[PDB]
Design an enzyme around this catalytic site. Structure first.
Site, PDB file in Angstrom:
ATOM      1  N   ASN B   9       1.070  -1.250   0.058  1.00 56.29           N
ATOM      2  CA  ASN B   9       0.188  -0.382   0.398  1.00 56.29           C
ATOM      3  C   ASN B   9       0.839   0.984   0.266  1.00 56.29           C
ATOM      4  O   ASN B   9       1.441   1.563   0.827  1.00 56.29           O
ATOM      5  CB  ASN B   9      -1.082   0.169   1.543  1.00 56.29           C
ATOM      6  N   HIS B  94      -9.649   0.557   5.845  1.00 54.33           N
ATOM      7  CA  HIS B  94      -7.598   0.872   6.195  1.00 54.33           C
ATOM      8  C   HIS B  94      -8.416   1.894   7.375  1.00 54.33           C
ATOM      9  O   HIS B  94      -9.268   2.627   7.110  1.00 54.33           O
ATOM     10  CB  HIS B  94      -7.459   1.933   5.334  1.00 54.33           C
ATOM     11  N   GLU B  96      -6.881   4.035   8.057  1.00 51.57           N
ATOM     12  CA  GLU B  96      -6.403   5.480   7.758  1.00 51.57           C
ATOM     13  C   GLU B  96      -7.700   6.610   7.305  1.00 51.57           C
ATOM     14  O   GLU B  96      -8.124   7.531   7.455  1.00 51.57           O
ATOM     15  CB  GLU B  96      -5.641   5.547   7.371  1.00 51.57           C
ATOM     16  N   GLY B 170       2.050   4.360  16.233  1.00 49.66           N
ATOM     17  CA  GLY B 170       2.930   5.734  17.567  1.00 49.66           C
ATOM     18  C   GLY B 170       2.758   5.204  18.364  1.00 49.66           C
ATOM     19  O   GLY B 170       4.030   6.004  19.497  1.00 49.66           O
ATOM     20  N   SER B 210       3.338  -3.138  11.238  1.00 51.80           N
ATOM     21  CA  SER B 210       4.932  -2.661  10.746  1.00 51.80           C
ATOM     22  C   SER B 210       5.789  -3.948   9.816  1.00 51.80           C
ATOM     23  O   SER B 210       6.523  -4.942  10.966  1.00 51.80           O
ATOM     24  CB  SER B 210       5.983  -1.690  11.811  1.00 51.80           C
TER      25      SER B 210
END
Lengths: 247, 247
Positions: B9, B94, B96, B170, B210
């Site tokens: 992505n 997603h 986001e 984060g 990740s």
């Protein structure tokens, strides 16, 4: 002395085949040299549309973009990518983003700042609803909508503003050119006060309702209608009639 | 079944130049035979990207699309125009989009149904936030997200599901392969209660955490992680080693 501007919002419409046709048809038409046309196809055809354009009078723009150039923002369009393939415009604040995707005035404000910042032109959409029109809160909203970007944007030499009569869409009410003349003149005055009459005299205010082949001339003598932000008719051959509605 | 799948992505990133170098690298790379690779560029670059792949294993998808093929939805992406251009996939849900654009569960389920209608495959994202994780409600968050889609689609032959531990992003928190195995096992044990074990055993469940060149290798031997939804690693040389990790 405001260059006639004609924008064509394809919306969620087009195919390589139809766009080709749409663009090949400009390229091929007689269009004044002294008119400004911008076509805005889905992001999916931006590169492709660019390829194809051959007339100095036409450019392409995107129908939306985010307020960042890059990063972790899956599914957005970036102004960097839009300049990368040669597009020069971005449409911001269209009623369909405002309603369905509930973009608020600060969102658009921020989006406008950012884009004008990156060197892309902005076609900024304002207009009220039926509810809002019926309470005669039309000048209220529109100055409220304009005020949020005025807060962030001091220059406007590269902004076109389009008014969308949202009350006139699927409501059974019709906007006349007289309605449009009125509202634009009004809008102009408002902006004259925040920006100065010189900057307001050169800013283009586009009429954004159902403008089409048959209509477009109807609005040739309204001194504050500087052009159009067309929907459905832009995907048709009548599109070229519009572009010539002045002469 | 369960052929390894690796989706990259790109999020809002890339230019014509840089998407060319990543494809070329892909073209010339010696990566395995039954491996499914989908690159997910910005809409602006799907046509172009398709034009450059020459490898049966690699296909292209978009990063989001609407729940309608055409109409008055300025700024949106259409599954039909993604098809016309030659991509095969669309990532739906997603974190986001669920966050900044707040796509609720039902929108997601709606858009999954549709895209399948039309024939493209979907990379369906699901994940709990940390806060949800803190409350220990991961399983309920994930089930609830998945059920909304079970409600509308009963054939998931075309859907690969991406598990994003939004709580490791984060936050200063880190997800392990063992974490992954646990979760995937659990969302797998759960789609079986509802889709029959055959369907469930054939469903590819990706880790959308990740994953990079350097740690891709630690998920081999994790039986329930069938692949990956990679991020920044995607635009870099090591996407390739992620590809070749199961080896």
């Amino acid at each position: 002395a405001r260059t006639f501007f004609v924008g064509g919002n394809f919306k969620l419409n087009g195919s390589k085949q139809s766009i080709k046709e749409i663009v090949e048809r400009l390229n091929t038409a007689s269009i004044p040299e002294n008119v400004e046309v911008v076509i805005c196809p889905p992001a999916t055809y931006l590169d492709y549309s660019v390829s194809l354009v051959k007339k100095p009078q036409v450019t392409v723009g995107a129908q939306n973009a985010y307020l960042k150039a890059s990063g972790a923002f899956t599914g957005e369009n970036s102004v960097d990518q839009i300049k990368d393939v040669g597009a020069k415009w971005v449409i911001l604040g269209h009623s369909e983003r405002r309603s369905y995707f509930h973009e608020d005035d600060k969102f658009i404000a921020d989006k406008t700042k950012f884009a004008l910042g990156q060197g892309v032109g902005v076609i900024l959409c304002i207009g009220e609803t039926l509810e809002e029109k019926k309470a005669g809160k039309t000048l209220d909203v529109v100055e409220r909508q304009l005020n949020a970007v005025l807060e962030e944007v001091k220059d406007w030499t590269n902004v076109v503003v389009a008014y969308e009569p949202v009350w006139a869409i699927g409501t059974g009410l019709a906007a006349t050119p007289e309605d449009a003349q009125d509202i634009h003149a009004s809008i102009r005055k408002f902006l004259a006060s925040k920006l100065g009459d010189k900057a307001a005299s050169e800013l283009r205010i586009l009429y954004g309702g159902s403008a089409n082949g048959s209509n477009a001339v109807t609005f040739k003598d309204k001194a504050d209608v500087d052009g159009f932000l067309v929907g459905g008719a832009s995907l048709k051959p009548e599109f070229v009639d519009i572009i010539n509605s002045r002469n």
